[PDB]
Amino acid sequence: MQLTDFKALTFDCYGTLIDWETGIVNALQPLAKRTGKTFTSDELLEVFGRNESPQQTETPGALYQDILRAVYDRIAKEWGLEPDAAEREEFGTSVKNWPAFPDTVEALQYLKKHYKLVILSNIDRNEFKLSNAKLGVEFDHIITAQDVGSYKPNPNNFTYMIDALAKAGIEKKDILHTAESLYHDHIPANDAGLVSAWIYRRHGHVPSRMPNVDFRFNSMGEMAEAHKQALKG
Template identity: 55%
Template sequence: MQLTDFTTLTFDVYGTLIDWESGMVAGLQPLLERTGRNLNRDQILEAHARHESSQQRYTPHLQYRLLLAVVYKRLAEEWGVTATHDECLAYGDFVKQWPAFADTAQALVYLKQHYQLVVLSNVDNESFAYSQRKLGVEFDAVYTAEDIGSYKPAQRNFDYMLEKLGERGIDKSQILHTAESMFHDHQPANRNGLANCWIYRRHDKQGFGATMNPGDMPSVDFRFNSMAELAEAHRQRV
């Protein structure tokens, strides 16, 4: 199997292209300053992952920025501090300010010359519009949780993506699903028989950060520690 075997890259965005962990920690600072606790970065992210995943199961219809507002409220309760409704909403809106990884835009510009680029993301459309401005390319298709009415790793999200791409003549054998999260993306990629590429942004860290522990680790067909490494590996094949 070679990178040049595929016509289409389907991307997770947050954690893969956008540095959501840094964005989360920055957005949570007002709350963290009131906790009086000495929480380290991974403790913060793991608590966030737990509440986010739970909320996505219970309210799959909720737009992501509004779901993040609920996560902020749950974190405040867990950490024993108060948060106003406006503060919760402000945290949800902060997703628009989450930064792209430094290598993302340049890598996408290169990859756009060789593949169709498709987004499958647990985000709402308004928030993604702000993120896309940081990513440097126009995607060939964008499928969001808001479009689908559920959140990855739900099978519904992958069914939707495969149906819509199939309508455009793109068979799943042509797709390389490219993502950081084992829980949200690589487990369902395995389940759906999709070739997959792990962008292991947390290669120098322990644990799973802002994503849930997947349990049994999925298999991956390619692994790179950054988007820049993916682009360079392709460049060496053409």
């Protein structure tokens, strides 16, 4: 089991490459400032998570911005504020502002030399295009929840991706699924017969079980460095 056994990295974007948590903390600043209260990042993320839950659907909405706009309205109400149209507009379009983790770009640029790179995203393709502009590489394949008709961890998202890759010449055994989320990514990766690289980020949705993972790295940078070390012998 070696990182060189694989030809394609199939990535989660949001949570693995793009730091959605920081993006949401930042995006909540205008509304939060209006409350006059000071929140910790964990507090903001708790409020976001609890208010995004009721927006979840089986068939994905075409535009992720509609989820964010609905969450904005709910949070403003929770905080005892009237929603503001301008604030809602900005919050709803905030994905483009969500930052890459500081290690992401250099790691992707290195890994792009050696692997076919794939995105499997629950956020729509147009938002991803805006994130892609700050990720520093071209992706070979981009698969979204809208394409599939469901959100990961639905197994169809993985089957669709695997089938797309097979048509592009990549056998299932040559895929390394690289992601932060045990629940959204590694449980279904296990069930789809993929090998997993867990990019654990800040570790330490509740996964029903702990999935098997074959590699563990704190960041994409660490994964890239492990590849470099592997090549050294």
